[PDB]
Design a protein around this ligand. Structure first.
Ligand SMILES: CCCCCCCC/C=C\CCCCCCCCCCCC(=O)O
Length: 133
């Protein structure tokens, strides 16, 4: 079910990430660095447990979760959130909740590319990742 998402992925296109970060309250200097960073995202499975790594020089993250089971998460920008990841329409949907706010991180496969759509407030960011061999 999750298997076409698995592997190592490299950022190849980003649209509106500054808008998304600004909506989350990320400061200007951090948004500069982020705007020039191309993370590597690694998605692995071991039974029911998925592990999603995001690697870059200035910041790394890692989460492990079971689909459909809430987990605590501390995001790259240091929000402490309540998270759940599910499959919806073949898309891997990650919902984060904190302080009565929400943001969604939706991953969809289109023509072999992984499209990540990030929504917070009115801001909608689209980032495209391509699979490493
Ligand atoms: C873990 C790498 C995240 C992207 C590079 C961040 C470089 C600047 C370092 C710290 C600031 C964190 C900034 C924005 C974090 C917003 C929430 C996570 C966005 C994930 C985007 C992605 O996976 O492509």
């Amino acid at each position: 079910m999750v298997d076409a998402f698995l592997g190592t992925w490299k950022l190849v296109d980003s649209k509106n990430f500054d808008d998304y970060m600004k909506s989350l309250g990320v400061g200007f200097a951090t948004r500069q660095v982020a705007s020039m960073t191309k993370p590597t995202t690694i998605i692995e499975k071991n039974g029911d447990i998925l592990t999603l790594k995001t690697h870059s020089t200035f910041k790394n993250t890692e989460i492990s979760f079971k689909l459909g089971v809430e987990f605590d998460e501390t995001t790259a920008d240091d929000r402490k959130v309540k998270s759940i990841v599910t499959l919806d329409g073949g898309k891997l949907v990650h919902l984060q909740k904190w302080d009565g706010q929400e943001t969604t991180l939706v991953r969809e496969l289109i023509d072999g590319k992984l499209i990540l759509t990030l929504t917070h407030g009115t801001a909608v960011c689209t980032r495209t990742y391509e699979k490493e061999a």
